[PDB]
Structure 1
Amino acid sequence: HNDLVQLCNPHIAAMKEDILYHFSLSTSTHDFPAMFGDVKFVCVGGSPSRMKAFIKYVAMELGFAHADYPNICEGTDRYAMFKVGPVLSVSHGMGVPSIAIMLHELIKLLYHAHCSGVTLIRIGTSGGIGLEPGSVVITRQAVDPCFKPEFEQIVLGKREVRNTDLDEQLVQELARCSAELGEFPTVVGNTMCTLDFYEGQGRLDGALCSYTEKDKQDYLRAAYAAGIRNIEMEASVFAAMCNACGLRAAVVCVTLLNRLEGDQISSPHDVLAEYQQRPQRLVGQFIKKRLMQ
């Protein structure tokens, strides 16, 4: 069996209209069950153009392809959204707050639509620690800059923390899917999530920096010793909010560089373009597998 999407907010049922402002969708203008009722896989990532390329790629893999892929979030440019069969693809911009806004409105969307048995997967990019560039990491545990699996949020002025573990069975399944493709290195490790790409990640190439190469190396190697294999900027809220609503979720990111060797992203454009298809291919394999059952 597969359970209905639940909220942790009793106010929503008591509203006569729910406006999904950042999607330009509303319960009074759109039929959510008709539009989204059959959704089973929701994939999210930073870049709208990557999330569109993803929907097209998955359409081909599941035999839906010919055709046009309309942006469901016409009426806004905050996020883009696409659908083919049971697969929904949504962009989320960059950063904890940007993906958090998307998650609130998306979980409400799935709830209004009465979706059931859903899986949510982030596909993204990151910096690796001690891994060859282009390696894919499947996140076991999302982790803060001090290495603790917690997400802190200020609510009405008070600090609140939620656990940021991810579903273990899902990560092992994702690892098997990657083994089946046999196309690129894929590890499971912890993922550090930060609020800043530059100083927040120990970079020396920001507009501000008051530390040395030695300080960076020491911090990064300490992170590695604590089991961290990559660094990005969304994993923490994603995990916390999915945990909060009882949703099975996973995070799959390609590394664009090895941070023990540098800060700048200088690989040729063709190499980066291909690196970024790796998570798509992995998740594509996962979805195809699930559908042949």
Structure 2
Amino acid sequence: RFVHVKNPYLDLMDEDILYHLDLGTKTHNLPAMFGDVKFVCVGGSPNRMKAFALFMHKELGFEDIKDICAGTDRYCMYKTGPVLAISHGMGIPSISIMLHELIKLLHHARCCDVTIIRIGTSGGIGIAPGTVVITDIAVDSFFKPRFEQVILDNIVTRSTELDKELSEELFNCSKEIPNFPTLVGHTMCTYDFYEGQGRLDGALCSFSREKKLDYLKRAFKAGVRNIEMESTVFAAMCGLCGLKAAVVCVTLLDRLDCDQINLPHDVLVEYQQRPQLLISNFIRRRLGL
């Protein structure tokens, strides 16, 4: 299963400059650097993805680690064996830029049988803080499994279907881990952290506590268990380009109780490190380690 691009113009170009990743087909040997990539792990925070790469290095059995995108502060990239770790910033536009350049990179490198997993934090709906949610379906603010984007003057809608067997395999992996609360459920992706997630603590708020609670309860009823900001564009682009995608997010709070993240530093760090424990278990099982 090869990673493929869906653009007939790429083939016509003499060189491909991955401007935001500060990489290129002329300046770099992409099949030699990335041809053996089988696992791509993406998160927002560059410090957290650096820590994930260092963690995976030890989990793969090996005994500081160079940013392949050291030339740019937009994104960071680390590679340990068949595992690629990439930061993507916050929001649908920031991850979309990364995904466009990454899908082109994996296709130039002729990668195949690639699993890509978004790891991060989210807000929970009716679930205990620190719960790990494996997304089965990524939905928009209207609880619809679709990704809408504007291309020129037109709105184009794409499917956000995530690989079902991969979400089942990640859940089966999670059961072996002690003190690891895990759940398979829908994930709602929004464009705004504050008004877009029904928060009452933003600079702007025109709705009531009752209106936000009714909204969150309807989301729970539609099967939504967590809220984040990258899942729909991630699921839509990866599925379409030959990548088996998954979303594994830890919850930092239950939105049916509050909007402000107020956790002790050591609890926040523990929760933040829960998705990487599952991915490590999953990669180690896939590689026979």
TM-score normalised over the length of structure 1: 0.97
* One of 251, 254, 258 as aligned partner of 2:254: 258
Question: Is 1:87 paired with 2:98?
Answer: no
Deviations 1:156-186 (A, max 9, x none): 1101101111111000000011001133110
Q: Secondary structure at the match of 1:181?
A: coil
Identity %, equivalent residues: 65
Question: Is 1:140 paired with 2:136?
Answer: yes
What is residue 30 of structure 1 aligned with on the other side?
A: 28
Q: How far apart, in 1, do the equivalents of 2:241 and 2:163 lie?
A: 13
Q: How far apart, in 2, do the equivalents of 1:71 and 1:252 lie?
A: 24
* One of 277, 280, 285 as aligned partner of 2:273: 277
Gaps of 5+ in 2: none
Alignment of 1:109-188 (within 5 A): 109-188=105-184
Deviations 1:122-175 (A, max 9, x none): 001100000000000000000010110010011111011011111110000000
What is residue 16 of structure 2 aligned with on the other side?
A: 18
Q: Secondary structure at the match of 1:238?
A: helix
* One of 24, 42, 45 as aligned partner of 1:44: 42
Structure 1 stretches of 4+ moved >3 Å:
none
| Structure 1 counterpart of 2:233, one-letter code | V
What is residue 229 of structure 2 aligned with on the other side?
A: 233
* One of 194, 201, 206 as aligned partner of 2:202: 206
| Structure 2 counterpart of 1:12, one-letter code | L
Q: How far apart, in 2, do the equivalents of 1:150 and 1:235 lie?
A: 11
What is residue 56 of structure 1 aligned with on the other side?
A: 54
| Structure 2 counterpart of 1:150, one-letter code | R
| Structure 2 counterpart of 1:174, one-letter code | L
Q: Secondary structure at the match of 1:83?
A: strand
Question: Is 1:100 paired with 2:92?
Answer: no
* Deviation (angstroms), 1:28: 0.8
RMSD (CA atoms): 0.9
Q: Secondary structure at the match of 2:175?
A: helix
Alignment of 1:2-13 (within 5 A): 3-13=1-11
Q: How far apart, in 1, do the equivalents of 2:186 and 2:30 lie?
A: 36
Q: How far apart, in 1, do the equivalents of 2:81 and 2:242 lie?
A: 23
* Deviation (angstroms), 1:12: 1.1
Q: Secondary structure at the match of 2:110?
A: coil
* Deviation (angstroms), 1:245: 1.1
Q: Secondary structure at the match of 1:180?
A: coil
| Structure 2 counterpart of 1:84, one-letter code | T
Q: How far apart, in 2, do the equivalents of 1:217 and 1:34 lie?
A: 52
Q: Secondary structure at the match of 2:176?
A: helix
Q: How far apart, in 1, do the equivalents of 2:222 and 2:258 lie?
A: 20
Gaps of 5+ in 1: none
Deviations 1:204-229 (A, max 9, x none): 00000011111111100010000000
Q: Secondary structure at the match of 1:137?
A: strand
